[PDB]
Amino acid sequence: KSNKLDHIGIAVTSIKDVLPFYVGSLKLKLLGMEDLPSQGVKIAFLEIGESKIELLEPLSEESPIAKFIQKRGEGIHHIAIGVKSIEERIQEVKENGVQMINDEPVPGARGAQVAFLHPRSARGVLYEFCEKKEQAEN
């Protein structure tokens, strides 16, 4: 409980080339964008209800996203679950037998602390735990 659907990450070769579909056809609001050269990605955030769609564009051929697109093609990359305490959640899923890609949280989009669960624990789905500092008002 308190689990939220934070976002869905979507691998694309070009944010610019899909914005006409997302903004023009689906009528989602583009919140903004960010560069994350440490993960080799540029990201665009689209609002969908209380969640977001995160469009992930590779910055170089060595980007994990470029590798994903090469092996699997463009499409849905991961589902992020917003959690209250990422350290405790990692410890709990590990105690229950889940294999992690990230045993310790790492920097993700929007200054969030993130950790990816191994798809082999989840029948081929890539889940991300996402802990964000609570910010609203003014």
Residues at the site binding Zn ion, with contacts judged by CB under 5 A? 9, 80, 128
Q: How many residues bind a second copy (CB under 8 A)?
A: 40
Q: Does the annotation place 128 within a ligand binding site?
A: yes
CB of 82 to a second copy, least distance (A): 8
Mapping DSSP onto H, E and C, the string for the chain reads CCCEEEEEEEECCCHHHHHHHHHHHCCCEEEEEEEECCCCEEEEEEEECCEEEEEEEECCCCCHHHHHHHHHCCEEEEEEEECCCHHHHHHHHHHCCCCECCCCCEECHHHCEEEEECHHHCCCCCEEEEECCCCCCC
x-or-dash string of contact with a second copy, 19-58, rule CB under 8 A: --x--xxxxxx------------------xxxx-------
Query: Taking CB within 5 to 8 Å according to partner kind, which of Zn ion, a second copy, none is near residue 26?
Result: a second copy
Choose one: 34-42, 56-64, 102-110, 117-125; the region binding a second copy (CB under 8 A).
117-125
Least CB distance from residue 33 to a second copy, whole Å? 17
Tokens coding 106: 């790492």
Q: Does 124 bind a second copy (CB under 8 A)?
A: yes
List the binding residues for Zn(2+).
7, 54, 78, 128
